[PDB]
Amino acid sequence: SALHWRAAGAATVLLVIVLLAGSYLAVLAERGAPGAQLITYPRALWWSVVTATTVGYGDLYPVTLWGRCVAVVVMVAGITSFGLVTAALATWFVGREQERRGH
Template sequence: MLPGFFTRVFAVLVGREGRSLHLKAAGGATIVLVLVMLAGSWAVVTAEQGARHANLTSYPKALWWSIETATTVGYGDFFPVTPWGRVVGAVVMVVGITTYGMVTAALATWFVGREDRRRGRAHQLREETVQALHARFDQLERLLTGERGGDR
């Protein structure tokens, strides 16, 4: 059941045919972020293993640290103390910031596109209404002119 779930999540994030490029990119970046957080958690535990004053000593702690680092929350409860641990932290930060920026941009583009399409439909409807009114007025003028011409 679990592999099927991940397959569906992957398909939703990057696989649909008709989706725009910015949504596919944001979905791909989200997948990369999750992989970087998972791998970064393992890498930071490995880098910090045996280091003096290390507090990232287990995978669950490191996973929590990678989530708060990627989201730039950074409570300060866990942090790397070795140079390699800090390199891993920098990678997690950059990927996290980039991903959240891409997702935010994709959502903003989607909202703007919807509004543009709505405005385009409203403009088209106004144009059609104006054309219909002009046709009615022309028809009324012809009727009035025809009645007057018949009375004279």
């Protein structure tokens, strides 16, 4: 395995851990805030993904400091990951156009 491919793999593993830990902690931050809805694990899990993907429907979102601090980590994980895959694909493609020119 080439590095770009390892780091994407690493980032996909690490993204999943962030999505799960994120779900757990979002519920743990958000319970105790009256009106908070991000307060059960299953939909937390859905929230974490709609967050890391930057889709962000807003059906759900945090309203407490630590919710928001957890949310900011999920986003960054999301964006970094979905930009290391791109960087990896860009390096795979560049490699293949180098061979198709003889280099």
